[PDB]
Amino acid sequence: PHCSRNPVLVRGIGRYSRSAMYSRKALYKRKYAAPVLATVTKPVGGDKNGGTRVVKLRKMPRYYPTEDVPRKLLSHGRKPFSQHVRKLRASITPGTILIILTGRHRGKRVVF
RNA sequence: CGAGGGAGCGAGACCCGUCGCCGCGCUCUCCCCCCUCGGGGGGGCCGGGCCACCCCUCCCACGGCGCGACCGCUCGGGGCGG
């Protein structure tokens, strides 16, 4: 698992080229010339009398609602809050004295 | 300031992915170096010739200078008729 072979000048633009990546990644010399009804799917279990029963994993629902909503289109761009990139103001640096305005400690001075 | 649309209503096997695009990151090749919360970063693997970086010669385009040939206007000398 190598790192990125080319740096980034700006967000979304490669540094050298596509061909310089062909040379840098060494795509040359990296050529890889590479030219039911009988069996149950996934049951597990047995039984004592009569043989071994076949269980069903994730059985069909016992109840169906009268109507349901259709699926969405995934929005193509959404990430969870944990995956978000954290921002920070330049003036906020460790050791800086801060003024808290909204909390019950209103107008108080605090070390960051 | 706004988000306004919703390409799964199957039985033994998903109640989901994603199309085109710039690409990139890695691996089915090999390594090395740096910083250590294994990750990140960096150097890469190799020959080639076009655009073209430093010296040369061709064809064309443009402008200027000089030379030669042809068409034109006009200033004279000579002869003819007037």
Swiss-Prot record:
Specify the protein name.
Answer: Large ribosomal subunit protein eL6
Q: Which residues carry this modification: Phosphoserine?
A: 75
Q: Which organism is it from?
A: Oryctolagus cuniculus
Q: What does this protein do?
A: Component of the large ribosomal subunit. The ribosome is a large ribonucleoprotein complex responsible for the synthesis of proteins in the cell.
Give the UniProt subcellular location, in the record's own words.
Answer: Cytoplasm, Cytosol; Cytoplasm; Rough endoplasmic reticulum
Which family is this protein grouped under?
Belongs to the eukaryotic ribosomal protein eL6 family.
Positions bearing N6-succinyllysine: 42
Subunit notes for this chain? Component of the large ribosomal subunit. May bind IPO9 with low affinity.
Q: List the disulfide bonds.
A: none
Q: Which residue windows are coiled coil?
A: none
Which span of the parent protein is shown here? 44 to 167 of 291
Origin: domain of life: Eukaryota
